């Protein structure tokens, strides 16, 4: 009976809430009291990458912390050399409405996807020195919103059909699907050990998945609106969410509840991108008010602003050596900060 | 400076190609097609390896290309997407215009279309995007006959209150009743459009007699008006 199923589930929610309340002995803010603050972080634009025509929707850095790919709605993928601001490749896309891009860990491949519901894989390292689409993965019934390589043969994508899938590049097929979300999934972030990954959807809820199984293990609620971005705290034991409720939060698998909410009265815009620093002390976000904000993850106090963009910041990425921060925006400009 | 030379050469060939790609990109107009009872996309094409489309059965965006007076146009109709458009609509924040086709012959769902048009108009990412209104299926044999009073989505005006506008230009030889009804419905969309819209964006109403008609000239003229208004605003002359 529907009614019975529902009532039982309400009681289950009360039990989960009661169990979560029984673990919140002390607040993270109280524990982090009497701790040195970071201090104002002055940031300057060391490099400015130009060449994109339309708004940039995504960017991903390489594993060498030198090469980065960027996707713009004009239908172009450009691999940059941020050391010298030299364009290395400019792949012409087959569908201009791209919303996500990725860089393979080996550096031999890139991915892109968007309103065409198809993830396309490009072979950067070819014998004749010319990139050309290597595989086109199809099956998603909704816009690809984020794609991230696990290795040269596996890649996880999220889509607007409230499902996430794991694909096999050489087979060409889905190998596992991860269902359970009710709204469109907007972003995912694979973990350091690559065994698990998180995804934020438009149901104001986040889920943790197991690539090698297929089931959601933890479900974290907390936000009031659509989760637009997600990442991972370096250790792999935490993740930060940025939503349209003008509030960033951090979560913990074992805590099974949020730890700290980063908000401000003067901030009423949503968060479009979220990325963590090397050590995880600095949480960088991106906002609809054309700026990005450095957030002290331990004290929930703003410690820097990267104002300089003229339109909405869409993407953000700190490197793997920590030595750079890139921001992309709806003004077709990329910036490197230090 | 031997391999750094090769890099700078590569970067320049790339910049040269990007210049041509910009040249092509700025010379075209991108349009988003919205609605639920439209059939003009299947007749526009006709008007303008093989031709066999190998599009994946799950394609999420369809695209049509047509040229009126050598100005190129790209119209994008959504495909295999879910009902919720709160997030994919943001991608079209820089299109030249939005075509909103509305069935004016089904009075039961006109309110739901009005609500969709209002939501499009008031969206913060589409506040500067002018829309072209296409009142589809204008052949109203429904108001010519009695069954079906227009006093549902209008339990107030057409319901005794709305008189045909004076600026109305009823097409030659046609019942004044259907003229009143269509101009009432048209005013119902324009009421919502002027509620908030100003110099940023305007709404252009057009009574698309079915879909089997010249229909690209309207879009070309409205895009021309939009472009002229934008330019005149940069020179602060409007």
């Amino acid at each position: 009976e529907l009614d019975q199923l529902r009532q039982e589930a309400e009681q289950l929610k009360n039990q989960i809430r009661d169990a979560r309340k029984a673990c919140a002995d002390a607040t993270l803010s109280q524990i982090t009291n009497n701790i040195d603050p970071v201090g104002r972080i002055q940031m300057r634009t060391r490099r400015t990458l130009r060449g994109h025509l339309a708004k940039i929707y995504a960017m991903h850095w390489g594993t060498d912390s030198r090469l980065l790919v960027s996707a713009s709605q004009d239908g172009k993928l450009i691999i940059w050399d941020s050391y010298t601001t030299n364009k290395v490749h400019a792949i012409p896309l087959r569908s201009s409405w791209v919303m996500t891009c990725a860089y393979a860990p080996s550096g031999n491949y890139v991915a892109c996807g968007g309103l065409d519901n198809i993830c396309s894989i490009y072979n950067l390292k070819t014998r004749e020195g010319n990139v050309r689409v290597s595989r086109e993965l199809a099956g998603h019934t909704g816009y690809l919103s984020c794609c991230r390589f696990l290795d040269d043969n596996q890649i996880v994508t999220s889509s607007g059909d409230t499902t996430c899938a794991l694909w096999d590049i050489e087979t060409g097929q889905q190998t596992t699907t991860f269902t359970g979300h009710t709204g469109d999934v907007m972003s995912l972030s694979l973990a350091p050990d690559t065994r698990l990954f998180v995804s934020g959807a438009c149901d104001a809820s986040a889920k943790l998945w197991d690539v090698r199984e297929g089931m959601c293990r933890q479900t974290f609620t907390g936000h009031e609106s659509d989760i637009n971005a997600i990442c991972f705290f370096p250790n792999g034991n935490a993740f930060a969410t940025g939503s349209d409720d003008a509030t960033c939060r951090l979560f913990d698998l074992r805590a099974d509840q949020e730890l700290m909410t980063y908000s401000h009265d003067n901030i009423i815009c949503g968060i479009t991108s979220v990325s963590f620093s090397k050590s995880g002390r600095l949480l960088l976000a991106g906002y609809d008010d054309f700026n990005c904000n450095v957030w002290d993850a331990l004290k929930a106090d703003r410690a820097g602003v990267l104002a300089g963009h003229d339109n909405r910041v869409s993407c953000l990425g700190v490197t793997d050596d920590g030595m750079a921060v890139a921001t992309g925006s709806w003004d077709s400009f990329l910036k490197i900060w230090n | 400076s031997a391999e750094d030379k090769a890099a700078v050469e590569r970067s320049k060939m790339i910049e040269k190609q990007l210049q041509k790609d910009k040249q092509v990109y700025r010379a075209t107009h991108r349009l988003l097609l919205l609605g639920a009872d439209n059939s003009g996309k299947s007749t526009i094409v006709k008007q303008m390896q093989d031709v066999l489309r190998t599009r994946v059965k799950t394609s999420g965006i369809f695209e049509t290309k047509f040229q009126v007076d050598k100005v190129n146009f790209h119209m994008f109709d959504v495909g295999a997407q879910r009902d919720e458009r709160r997030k994919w609509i943001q991608c079209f924040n820089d299109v030249t215009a939005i075509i909103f086709v509305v069935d004016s012959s089904d009075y039961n769902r006109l309110q739901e279309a009005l609500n969709d048009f209002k939501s499009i108009w008031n969206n913060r990412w589409l506040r500067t995007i002018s829309v072209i209104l296409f009142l589809n299926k204008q052949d109203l044999l429904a108001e010519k006959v009695l069954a079906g009073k227009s006093k549902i989505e209008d339990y107030f005006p057409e319901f005794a209150r709305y008189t045909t506008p004076e600026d109305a230009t009823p097409e030659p030889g046609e019942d004044p009743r259907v003229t009143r009804a269509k101009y009432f419905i048209r005013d119902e969309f324009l009421r919502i459009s002027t509620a908030s819209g100003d110099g940023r964006h305007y709404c252009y109403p057009h009574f698309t007699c079915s879909v089997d008609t010249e229909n690209i000239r309207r879009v070309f003229n409205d895009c021309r008006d939009i472009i002229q208004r934008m330019h005149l605003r940069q020179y602060e002359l409007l």
Partner: nanobody
Framework: QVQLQESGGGLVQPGGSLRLSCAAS????????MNWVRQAPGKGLEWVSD????????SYTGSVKGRFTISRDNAKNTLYLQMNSLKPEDTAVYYC?????????????????????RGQGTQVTV
């Protein structure tokens, strides 16, 4: 967890009165636009009425204009809908709905049973 719970549905002869209260919990009530939708048997979801953050601007569907009235209690975190002079075409399940983003004028919510921030419903039979 954003949840919204409705109340007040029941059986009444045509021309009677009915009051529907939607209790909100899980979010700042003052920062959101609120709406009302209903689903008649054999028909999809359809918007009814709306109230802004402060309650200044109110709009209603033509079929219920002049009869049903909507109000909100910011302190109590509730949206209300007073119904009078019923006719048997309002036999539907009433879902109290919320707009997705705060401080926003647009509202996409009457979606095909997929919207997350919408109530579970009160059957109203007349």
């Amino acid at each position: 967890q954003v949840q919204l719970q409705e109340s007040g549905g029941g059986l009444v002869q045509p021309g009677g009165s009915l009051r529907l209260s939607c209790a909100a919990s899980g979010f700042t009530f003052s920062n959101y636009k609120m709406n009302w939708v209903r689903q008649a048997p054999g028909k999809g979801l359809e918007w009814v009425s709306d109230i802004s953050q402060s309650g200044a601007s109110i709009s209603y569907t033509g079929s219920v204009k002049g009869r049903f009235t909507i109000s909100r209690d910011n302190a109590k975190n509730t949206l209300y809908l007073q119904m009078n002079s019923l006719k048997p075409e309002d036999t539907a399940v009433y879902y109290c709905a919320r707009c997705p983003a705060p401080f926003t004028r647009d509202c996409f919510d009457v979606t095909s049973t997929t919207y997350a921030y919408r109530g579970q419903g009160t059957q109203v039979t007349v």
